[PDB]
Design a protein around this ligand. Structure first.
Ligand code: GDP
Ligand code: MG
Lengths: 428, 67
C-alpha cells in the first residue's frame, strides 16, 4: 500500500499543515510550482505516498484543506507553498465555529461535512492502494476539534478497513485562546480513543516550555511553536516517505506500536532542538543525539517519562552516520535504563536510519514513544474540565447547540477510564 | 452515532423555535392586557365626568322647579 490522504482542519490544523507540506516538499525537491528540482533518486522513490502526479510532470499534495471560516485558508493560499495545493481541495464555510466543539461536530460542521467527503472520495478513487488518512487539527478550538472528529467518524464509516491517524495539538493555559479548551479537548479525546489507530499528542504546554526554557525565546509565538511541530512531523513520517525497512507504512507502524487498541496516543521527541532561523554549526555525535532524543526536555508532550514505562518505542536517525554506532547507542540506552521499558514486550525498541537529513542539520533523531506516562497529559485536561464542570460553568455555549450534560459526563468518564487503563499497564 | 447527531441538531432547532414562539406569545399577551387596562382607566374617567353632567342637569332642573 502506498497512498496517504492528508486532511488539515481549522486554524491550527491548517497552520501546522501548511508548514508540514512546506518542509516535506523541500525534502522531496518539490518547489512552489510543483516542479521537481532535486539531485537524488531517494527523493522520488516513494513520492506517491504524499503526492499525486498530474502531467507536467508536476507533483500535487494529496491534501484537503478544511475550515468553517475563510480567514486561515486565504492565509495558506497566499502563503509560501500556497500555489501547490489543488484549488478544489479547499473546502470552507463562512460562519466559523467560535471555539465551540458542539458547533464543529453537530451544527455548523454538519452543514459542511458532506462537501469534504466528496473531496475525500475523489482523492481516494485515484489511489492504487490507499493506506489511510492523516489529520492535523487542534483539540482546543471548534473546527479542528469538533468538525475534525466528525470527519473521522464519517471517514471510518465509509472506509472501515483503512488506517486513521492524527497529529492532535493539546491545549494548555500557558498558550490559550479561551477557557472552554478543556471542554473541547475532553469531548475530542473521547472520539479519538474510539476512532483513530494512532495519535501523535502535540502538547502546546511542552512546545511552550521548550521554546522558553531551552531555546531561550522569552515570548514564543505560534510560528516558534510550529517550527518544532513541523520538525517532529517531518521526523515521524520519514519511514513512510523514504525507502526503508521498518514502520514503512501506516499499518505496520500501528502493529508495532499499539499493543491494546485504546492505548494509541504517542509522545514524540526530537533532537537537536533548534529555533527558527538561527543555525547550529556543530553536528551532534551519535551518543549526543541518542541522549537528547530520550530526554524529557526534548518531548513534545509535557509528561515525565520517568513517571511511567515505555510499552513500545520507534526511533528514526537521519543523516550520514555510523549505523554500528547507532545500534550500540540505542542498545546502551535500553540496557542502562531497562526498568523503564516493560519486560513483557521483548525488544520493544525499533530503530531506523535514513541517509537524507532534514534542511539545515547534518544529523537528527526523532523519537516516537508509547509511554504510560502520557496519562499525565489526560489527568491535566481532566482536572481543568472538572474545575469548570462541577459548577457547570460555560456550559450554555454547548446546550444552546443541542447538547445535554450527559454527553460531557460520558466523555469525562471515558477519559478517566483511559487514564486508569494506562495505570494498569504501568504496574503490570 | 448518526441518529444521535440528527437528534442534537433537531433539539437545537426545537429550542430556538420554542424561544421564538414563547417570546411572540408573552409579548402579545402583554400588549393585549395593556390596551385593555389603559382603555378601562380611560372609560372610568369618562364615566366620572359623565356623572358630573348628569348632576349639573339635575341641579339646573332643581332651580327651575322653584318660584
Ligand atoms: N501549536 C499551535 N497551536 C495552535 C495554533 N493555532 C491555534 N492553536 C491552539 O489551537 C487551539 C484553538 O484551536 P484553533 O485551531 O484556533 O480553532 P479552530 O479553527 O476552531 O479549530 C488552542 O489550543 C490554541 O492554543 C498553532 O498555529 N500552533
Ligand atoms: Mg483560533
Amino acid at each position: 500500500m502506498r497512498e496517504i490522504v492528508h486532511i488539515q482542519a481549522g486554524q491550527c490544523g491548517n497552520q501546522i499543515g501548511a508548514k508540514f507540506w512546506e518542509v516535506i516538499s523541500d525534502e522531496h525537491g518539490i518547489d512552489p510550482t510543483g516542479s521537481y528540482h532535486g539531485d537524488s533518486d531517494l527523493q522520488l522513490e516513494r513520492i506517491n505516498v504524499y503526492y499525486n502526479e498530474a502531467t507536467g510532470n508536476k507533483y500535487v499534495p494529496r491534501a484537503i484543506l478544511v475550515d468553517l471560516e475563510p480567514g486561515t485558508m486565504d492565509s495558506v493560499r497566499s502563503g509560501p507553498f500556497g500555489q501547490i495545493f489543488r484549488p478544489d481541495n479547499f473546502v470552507f464555510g463562512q460562519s466559523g465555529a467560535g471555539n465551540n466543539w458542539a458547533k464543529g461536530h453537530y451544527t455548523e460542521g454538519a452543514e459542511l461535512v458532506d462537501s469534504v467527503l466528496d473531496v475525500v472520495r475523489k482523492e481516494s478513487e485515484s489511489c492504487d492502494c490507499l493506506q489511510g488518512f492523516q489529520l492535523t487539527h487542534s483539540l482546543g478550538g471548534g473546527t479542528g476539534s469538533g468538525m475534525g472528529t466528525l470527519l473521522i467518524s464519517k471517514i471510518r464509516e465509509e472506509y472501515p478497513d483503512r488506517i486513521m491517524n492524527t497529529f492532535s495539538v493539546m491545549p494548555s493555559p500557558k498558550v490559550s485562546d479561551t477557557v472552554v479548551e478543556p471542554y473541547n479537548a475532553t469531548l475530542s479525546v473521547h472520539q479519538l480513543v474510539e476512532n483513530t489507530d494512532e495519535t501523535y499528542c502535540i502538547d502546546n504546554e511542552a512546545l511552550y516550555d521548550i521554546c522558553f526554557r531551552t531555546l531561550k525565546l522569552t515570548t514564543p509565538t505560534y510560528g516558534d511553536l510550529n517550527h518544532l511541530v513541523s520538525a517532529t512531523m517531518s521526523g515521524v513520517t520519514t519511514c513512510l516517505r523514504f525507502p526503508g525497512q521498518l514502520n514503512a507504512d501506516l499499518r505496520k507502524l500501528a502493529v508495532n506500536m499499539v499493543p491494546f487498541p485504546r492505548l494509541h496516543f504517542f509522545m514524540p521527541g526530537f533532537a537537536p532542538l533548534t529555533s527558527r532561523g538561527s543555525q547550529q554549526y556543530r553536528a551532534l555525535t551519535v551518543p549526543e543525539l541518542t541522549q537528547q532524543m530520550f530526554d524529557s526536555k526534548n518531548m513534545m508532550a509535557a509528561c515525565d517519562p520517568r513517571h511511567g514505562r515505555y510499552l513500545t518505542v520507534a526511533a528514526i536517525f537521519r543523516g550520514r552516520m555510523s549505523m554500528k554506532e547507532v545500534d550500540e547507542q540505542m542498545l546502551n540506552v535500553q540496557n542502562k535504563n531497562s526498568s523503564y521499558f516493560v519486560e513483557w514486550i521483548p525488544n520493544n525498541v525499533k530503530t531506523a536510519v535514513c541517509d537524507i537529513p532534514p534542511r539545515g542539520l547534518k544529523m537528527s533523531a526523532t523519537f516516537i514513544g508509547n509511554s504510560t506516562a502520557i496519562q499525565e497529559l489526560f489527568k491535566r485536561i481532566s482536572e481543568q474540565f472538572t474545575a469548570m464542570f462541577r459548577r457547570k460553568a460555560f456550559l450554555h455555549w454547548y446546550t444552546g447547540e443541542g447538547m445535554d450534560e450527559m454527553e460531557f459526563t460520558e466523555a469525562e468518564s471515558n477519559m478517566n477510564d483511559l487514564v486508569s487503563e494506562y495505570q494498569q499497564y504501568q504496574d503490570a | 452515532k448518526r441518529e444521535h447527531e440528527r437528534e442534537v441538531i433537531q433539539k437545537a432547532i426545537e429550542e430556538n423555535n420554542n424561544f421564538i414562539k414563547m417570546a411572540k406569545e408573552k409579548l402579545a399577551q402583554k400588549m393585549e392586557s395593556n390596551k385593555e387596562n389603559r382603555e378601562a382607566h380611560l372609560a372610568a374617567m369618562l364615566e366620572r365626568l359623565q356623572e358630573k353632567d348628569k348632576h349639573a342637569e339635575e341641579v339646573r332642573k332643581n332651580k327651575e322647579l322653584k318660584e
